[PDB]
Structure 1
Amino acid sequence: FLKEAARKRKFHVIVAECAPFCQGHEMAVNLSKAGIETTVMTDAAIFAVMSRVNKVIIGTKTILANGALRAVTGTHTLALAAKHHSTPLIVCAPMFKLSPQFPNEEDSFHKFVAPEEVLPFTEGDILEKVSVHCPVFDYVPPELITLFISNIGGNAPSYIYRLMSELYHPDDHVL
């Protein structure tokens, strides 16, 4: 989306990663080298600069049957922040991830990794009593996405149950 938008037009992207372990740097370098003029941001100073930003676009991993979305880490916080400035937040997820799960019906769609991801093992005798933990995902409520970008075109944030009634067999939610 970004590099094809940059293929004719000009902008200035500013990017905070997601880092219990980082991978936003990979996109940062991957579109450092097609001439985009990115800034890579720490994952906390969003609120310092999102007052000055005017649009914000994230890409999730899977979106579910509330019209909602479990995304990568740190998306709920930046999404609520962007609601606080009322600037529109755009999910660029296709018609391919739409899933009949519902958030707290199941057992902890946030689930967890080895926290050596989030702790260096070299600190001493500190780690025995403490039970550190971190998830792989977040959860954003479906009131908060402004507009999908599917393949067929922009669709409503709550355009979802008819998508499931005539894009699935909704009797087969046995799975």
Structure 2
Amino acid sequence: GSELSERIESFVETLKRGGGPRSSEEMARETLGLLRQIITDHRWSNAGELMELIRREGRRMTAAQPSETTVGNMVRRVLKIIREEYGRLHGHYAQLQSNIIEAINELLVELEGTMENIAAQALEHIHSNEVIMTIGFSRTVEAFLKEAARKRKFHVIVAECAPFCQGHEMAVNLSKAGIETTVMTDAAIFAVMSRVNKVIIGTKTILANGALRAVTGTHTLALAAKHHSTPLIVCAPMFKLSPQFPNEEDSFHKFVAPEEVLPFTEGDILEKVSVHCPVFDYVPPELITLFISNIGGNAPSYIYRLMSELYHPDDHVL
């Protein structure tokens, strides 16, 4: 009934003003659960009508927050699942709803196991007496790093984020396990990155041409890595892959209040000074070297095939 409507409204309102679930995995789980909920109890008698309803709901969710490119991926995945389950019978409509829930539950189990599947490939890329540089705070990268510390000894360098210094929390959580971590500012990313050998970072989403949307300052890190010819591993699950391409990207960066960059207590200079605080940035694919996912490491030049296997080319614009 209208309980579904109020749940959808609460979800959209939570996505509107601030962040809801802290972890991207929880965001994807909640989105898939909401999709399954709107699918299970609804008046629907065809496949195209359900596809249109799902497209409308996904459009609403995306308009709520354009930078949160995780709900659109789940919407497109559900659309692809529906299309495949409809074509398997048409190429009908007797028990499609019964197996749609089964496919959604399988996708949920995959989303639950993706973290363990990604963390299992830690030793294959880290050796003894190695130094690794990261940036920001990512749970996947944290697991990837602490899965190798139990059998290897390396030096982890962590570059904080100037607007929201979240790298301190990552460094503390890592040092809590005895990994010999380090803390530093963003300005010291190039002068210090001459003794580093490997770089392992996360991202918010992966674009179509191999590029990705990462936190601010990741572009300078990738530039330094390419200047020093150091590998740049990206630990990102499958749900972080977006079929959209690098359009001129006006709504790409998330602009927040300048309170973080410049405080309100500065004085009268705030009226004639324009302060900008972009949270995310665009990272080209040429500066990337590898992509570690729950299905094995791949190169940036092969993400198009993963997309073709995940989403349908007709649902790219939604």
Q: TM-score range with shorter-chain normalisation? A: over 0.9
Structure 1 contact 103–109 (Cα < 8 Å) conserved: no
Task: Give 1:60 shift.
Answer: 0.9
Identity among equivalent pairs (%): 100
Structure 2 contact 244–317 (Cα < 8 Å) conserved: no
Using structure 1 for the length normalisation, give the TM-score: 0.95
- CA offsets, 1:3-38, max 9 Å, x none? 111111100111111221211111011111011110
Q: How many Å separate the matches in 2 of 1:56 and 1:89?
A: 5
Structure 2 contact 202–236 (Cα < 8 Å) conserved: yes
Q: How many Å separate the matches in 1 of 2:186 and 2:309?
A: 40
1:76 is paired with a residue whose SS is helix
Superposition RMSD in Å: 1.2
Task: Give 1:111 shift.
Answer: 2.5
Q: Residue 105 of structure 1 aligns with which residue?
A: 248
2:233 is paired with a residue whose SS is strand
Structure 1 contact 92–149 (Cα < 8 Å) conserved: yes
- CA offsets, 1:46-98, max 9 Å, x none? 21221111111111111111111010110001100111011111111111111
Q: How many Å separate the matches in 1 of 2:198 and 2:258?
A: 33
- CA offsets, 1:98-137, max 9 Å, x none? 1011222554211200010111211111110111111110
Structure 2 contact 198–230 (Cα < 8 Å) conserved: yes
1:165 is paired with a residue whose SS is helix
Whose helix fraction is larger, Structure 1's or Structure 2's? Answer: 2
Structure 1 contact 72–136 (Cα < 8 Å) conserved: yes
Instruction: Flag structure 1 segments of 5+ consecutive residues without an equivalent.
Output: none
Structure 1 contact 100–164 (Cα < 8 Å) conserved: yes
1:158 is paired with a residue whose SS is helix
Structure 1 runs of 4+ off > 4 angstroms?
A: none
Higher-Rg structure is 2
Q: How many Å separate the matches in 1 of 2:261 and 2:291?
A: 32
* 274, 279, 284: which one aligns with 1:131: 274
Structure 1 contact 21–118 (Cα < 8 Å) conserved: no
Structure 2 contact 156–182 (Cα < 8 Å) conserved: yes
State yes or no: 1:96 paired with 2:239: yes
Q: How many Å separate the matches in 2 of 1:72 and 1:106?
A: 15
Structure 1 contact 67–158 (Cα < 8 Å) conserved: yes
- Of the structure 1 ranges 101-110 and 134-143, higher mean CA displacement relative to structure 2 is found in 101-110
Using structure 2 for the length normalisation, give the TM-score: 0.53
The one of the two structures with greater contact order (alpha-carbon pairs below 8 A, sep at least 6) is 1
Structure 1 contact 65–160 (Cα < 8 Å) conserved: yes
- Of the structure 1 ranges 33-42 and 161-170, higher mean CA displacement relative to structure 2 is found in 161-170
Q: How many Å separate the matches in 2 of 1:2 and 1:165?
A: 31
